[PDB]
Amino acid sequence: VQATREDKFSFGLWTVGWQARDAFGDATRTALDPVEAVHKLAEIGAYGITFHDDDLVPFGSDAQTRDGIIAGFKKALDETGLIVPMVTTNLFTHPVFKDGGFTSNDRSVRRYAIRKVLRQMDLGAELGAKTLVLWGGREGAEYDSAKDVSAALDRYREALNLLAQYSEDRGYGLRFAIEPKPNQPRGDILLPTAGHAIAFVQELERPELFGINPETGHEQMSNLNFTQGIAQALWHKKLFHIDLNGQHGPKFDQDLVFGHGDLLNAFSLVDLLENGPDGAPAYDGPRHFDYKPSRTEDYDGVWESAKANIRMYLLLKERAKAFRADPEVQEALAASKVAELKTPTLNPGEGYAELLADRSAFEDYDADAVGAKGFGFVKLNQLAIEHLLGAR
Amino acid sequence: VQATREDKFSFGLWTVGWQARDAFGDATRTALDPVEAVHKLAEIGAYGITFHDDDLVPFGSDAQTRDGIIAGFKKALDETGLIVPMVTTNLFTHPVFKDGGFTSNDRSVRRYAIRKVLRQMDLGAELGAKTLVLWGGREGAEYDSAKDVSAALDRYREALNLLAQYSEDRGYGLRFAIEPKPNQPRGDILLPTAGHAIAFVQELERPELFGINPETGHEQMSNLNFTQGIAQALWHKKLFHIDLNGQHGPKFDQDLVFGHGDLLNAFSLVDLLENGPDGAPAYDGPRHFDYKPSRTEDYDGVWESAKANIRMYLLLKERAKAFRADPEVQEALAASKVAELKTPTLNPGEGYAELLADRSAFEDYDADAVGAKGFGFVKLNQLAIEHLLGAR
Amino acid sequence: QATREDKFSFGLWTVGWQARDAFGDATRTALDPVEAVHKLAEIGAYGITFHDDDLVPFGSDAQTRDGIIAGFKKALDETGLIVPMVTTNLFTHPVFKDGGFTSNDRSVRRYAIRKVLRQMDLGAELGAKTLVLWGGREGAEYDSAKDVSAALDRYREALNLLAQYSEDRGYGLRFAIEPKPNQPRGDILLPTAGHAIAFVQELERPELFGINPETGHEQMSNLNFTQGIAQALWHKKLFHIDLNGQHGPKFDQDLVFGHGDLLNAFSLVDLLENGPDGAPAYDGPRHFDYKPSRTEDYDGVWESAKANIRMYLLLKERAKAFRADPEVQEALAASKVAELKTPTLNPGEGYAELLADRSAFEDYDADAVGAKGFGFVKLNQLAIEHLLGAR
Amino acid sequence: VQATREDKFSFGLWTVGWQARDAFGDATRTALDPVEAVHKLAEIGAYGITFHDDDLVPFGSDAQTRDGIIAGFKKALDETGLIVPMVTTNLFTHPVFKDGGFTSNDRSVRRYAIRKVLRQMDLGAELGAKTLVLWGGREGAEYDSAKDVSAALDRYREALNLLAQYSEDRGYGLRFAIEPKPNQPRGDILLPTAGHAIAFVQELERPELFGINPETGHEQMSNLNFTQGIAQALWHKKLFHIDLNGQHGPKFDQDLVFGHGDLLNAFSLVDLLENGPDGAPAYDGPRHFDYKPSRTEDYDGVWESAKANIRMYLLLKERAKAFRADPEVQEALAASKVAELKTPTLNPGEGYAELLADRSAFEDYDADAVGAKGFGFVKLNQLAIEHLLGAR
């Protein structure tokens, strides 16, 4: 198929621009020019581009240079019609952030980290971005006694409250998306899963402005069900953005093309986002790919991988719809009682008093007979998969 | 050392009573009489005993039988002075619960699950229990299309609000603690980590009556840092109860004696719980051991293992105390700047306007010089381990 | 549709699993063995396997035992099903709580061998060609409780005996050690396919020993199952295979083959079928060692049995199409997959000739070579598209 | 308390020399001078140093430079009395090795990789090294269809056979140690575990010259039991060298100080290596630390961390000795029948026929009665932990 701007496929500058310098080796590709990136991505079907401050403007650029880069960058967007849906700040590369940005043990680093974000918020606001993604990659520890978690959560909250204050007062209208990750680069990162991140956000001053940006690989690094966590995120209404990529369970973060890691879970994820209630998608934000072209590839492999992300999503979408439209699947869903879960356990107006009065819910309930009936889940799964294989 | 009632060590009837029938074999031990279990626990220094409805009263016992059991039980409690600080319900054993209790796709099972719990709340309230633990072991799925998570969270919530209501109205004064687990027995369980449970609890009708009951091995099954997750639970003030045991990373749940799995994390956990703010413990509920005596042991090994849990806790407590009273450790803490995290990042009355005006926070900040100072974390970790090893 | 040439087999204990798990009672009633034979024959299975204790209840008197066997043989006869492999339950009974062959208790070890000898005679009687040995209770929960070195000596001692016996009696059995990292023990001896092959190389008649790797068992450690099978085939030790599905490191799920890591299920079928000639690289039984989920009744059980065969045949078809695609041939050429098969050295070349080749070092432009891409993502993308029936 | 040359502690130049440039950030430490490294290690008690060709001589140095560096290095060893027990080659950093050295799909890379190694073998021999470690970090793949494993193993073997031929012909008397690793940097690496590396070695032309160099964290990345793995390597007599470090389960390779990851396994490991048959160690090679001083530390932190490894090993040794020497432990071992595993299952000269005729081994065997006796394993384990904690 073909991507449309209505699909809202976005990519970070750092994705197709990853030079492939890994933990054990030198870069295998030369640097990617941002203007070219804009052009190349516009060409493959992306509707937007994102970036960290330092991806666009080299750390420690004088004003003139910085200004110079932005102006050229805006031209390219202009020309191509791409937007900047989200912006983020690099609080992990420079040595000063070795112990964190917002929660560094060092107070001077914390103050600096906030200044650095404020400045990116301004550029973001100016480019029309709606979301500020916050990935606290250096927030965490290698040793338990080196970090007071409670104090760290206080300092994290303290920084977020300020950013919300600023944005509201300047009238930027940003939404903030906290990105959880279990480890890498710290032995243990704070807010390790989608869950911890949502619980945290609920403790902020203007919780309505905060959500999460879960990434496929991050949850899989802990062997969690990505689709299920996204389902919980949507239940809470905190899915402000999403990072799509592939991973092969608990190991270093691979950042593969979306659907190149856990294919079955990539399938159910697309089904959840698109086969939303009232026909429509359950999620309307950017479908952002935060992946990395393998170290073994050249610039051609890079564009190939960029396109593979889009094809994977559209092929899966196509099969999720067919699946839902299949009468045999409909019959299987019925036998599995999937929809009976949507009917309240209690009859309208019933409370514990009436439930207690219902002998059929306990005293006269035949648990044994109910326990003998199967749910037909295997058959239902077999049909989903045959839809995925294009075997139906 | 010796355990005192002030230590608040409690054990589940199902721990020392596990007959050791595992997934691949038959029981290796005969059943333990509840009265006998009360006497033996009292003798090793436990202050309380806990149980699932079905551990005490065999599933489907007539009222005369049940009444007889309860009465004999109360006598033992009376005679020994042990208390029942928490009670729980078995919503996982009987075949009727194969697709869950509160979230089974089948409506009638959902209604029966609630009645089974209400009945247990009554007995709990009569025994003086203050906490009702909820472990939704069957709430989840093996296949993504078999369960509507959103509908499931709705149903979960629907059941829990009723329980709070009933408890409120009857004046039971119970606190509810949801126990997260990532998998086992379902392929994926709903509310997989302490984070997900906390975020969920925040959405109930009366969040104040709800917290979590996190278990050491459950978080380690996902290879998460248990101590750090507890630290976050404490920050939210949602640590209502705790299950202590041992585990060796991501694999089936082993339920070893506390400290026999990740020893270093057990050590930092005891430090966190007992060396709380203001001299005193950061947590005051029961120190509950939800473990299983290894299948290779006989009743002698069973009491040995019951005693090993307490010994382990007391030995680590002793070492945690010594660790903190060491002037050298104190000096390392100061050099690592642990306490400096506790100081707000912003000066009193400082806002973004003032922060933006501080050139020392950015314009004149020497990132490069700060980035070069070491935190001394390794040295601090080494002193901690030397304390644990009794080498200091 | 399955044919006897596909060689699909199932263990009696897979479809017959009552779904009594670590936390709940059984949700299904017992399956009758004759019935299992008839139902499996019906879905296209060519063979059935069993642990001694799955067919003949532990402790049956000879009359009883004899009665059951005669019944079973008759069902085989009628349906035309064979018994390619047999195994022994050395894990259920309490006596085996510390192991069969490597129990600390000498008397259990002796008994463990007697139990297996007995099953060997029955296997021989039924025409089985492979004896699978799953040492599920061999290992430990605590490091000081088990002397690993003495354990391997005792594991070896027991196997050498079994081989002697088989060889003296003319049974012609092949022995396949089944590795598992854990469950039921905290740590099981011979935890991966690699550990088991290395061990087998140390027995008295190594040619008689190989392995029986299980998809889920390697995945429990997060290992690449296909890649381990490739190494097993290279050593020529793939004597049998147990297929099922798993979702990484967690308890063993025993899902239907292909319901866990689908990409790896695809590369595995490609490996086993798109062998050397045009021919399969593996000629043994495709054994499904799985469990129908606890949420299912007997209709679910038969559906899950068929799902295993369906997944393999669907994967096979896509594997074949993948290889026949000219676009794939082109990507394989760009990726230099086949260049790996050409020896690094030219015929008759040794270290002296290599050392004299200035072009292999002194004049080698590493920077230039390091800049060319392998085109692996593109190759991967064509593979997935074949899998999805998108081409 | 103090290290002796008899302890055989070695460190790789790349360990203390790691500048802390990780996957997400820039180096936080300056480069370490090889000569200085030699003096500092000599000073902390190390008996030897190891290096990758490229750690000592910058990739692409002319012979004049190369030669000068070697001469200075040689001097330092001279003055300090340190030896070079092992050398290794870097076949992972340079972009040319992106698909492997010996198993690169590119034939020219394979020829080049062999040449690089032959050269390092020459330097090794000149410095007196006895072991050549081969870590095939880039041998493997991210995608299944990209690598023919069979062909790969043929090419790995082809290369290794030539290396043995050469050493043997030049009379170097080297031993070759293959270092297994499951992943990082490739998605999956060939010879992922100690078991796979041993099986492979058995297929070489002169297998007696080959063994493995297992690393603590490498086996732990797969959640395997490192001690049990070493036990198997010792049974085969293939433990040619060993890399000690710490790791926290399946996640990126942390390379912490030895014993700072799984402490309990670090303990059983020292016990295995040191309490060998008849008092003597079961292993006689170097106790090599292949770790990295955390990114948060400075050079002070670096030397501290170097010493921490030595300390950890000697503290554990000390407790392993005391554990074994304790008559209570000796009694628990007897009760658990640990040594009974050493007695052959079969009586002297007993074969299948005598065993088949022994009614006590089957017909008259009381399995139910034996099945009920406990093994006393929890208690033995508790005794071990108490010795570790310095409580006994």
Ligand SMILES: O=C[C@H](O)[C@@H](O)[C@H](O)CO
């Ligand atoms: O693990 C790295 C993160 O995924 C990163 O790319 C963020 O999303 C942006 O800072």
Ligand SMILES: O=C[C@H](O)[C@@H](O)[C@H](O)CO
């Ligand atoms: O994994 C089992 C659970 O931990 C259970 O013991 C709960 O704590 C109470 O049902």
Ligand SMILES: O=C[C@H](O)[C@@H](O)[C@H](O)CO
């Ligand atoms: O994990 C269980 C094993 O796979 C078992 O079924 C063997 O294959 C036969 O005992």
Ligand SMILES: O=C[C@H](O)[C@@H](O)[C@H](O)CO
């Ligand atoms: O994972 C990195 C390896 O441990 C490496 O240090 C080798 O031992 C030497 O090439």
Ligand SMILES: [Mg+2]
């Ligand atoms: Mg991301």
Ligand SMILES: [Mg+2]
């Ligand atoms: Mg529990």
Ligand SMILES: [Mg+2]
């Ligand atoms: Mg099997």
Ligand SMILES: [Mg+2]
């Ligand atoms: Mg190493």
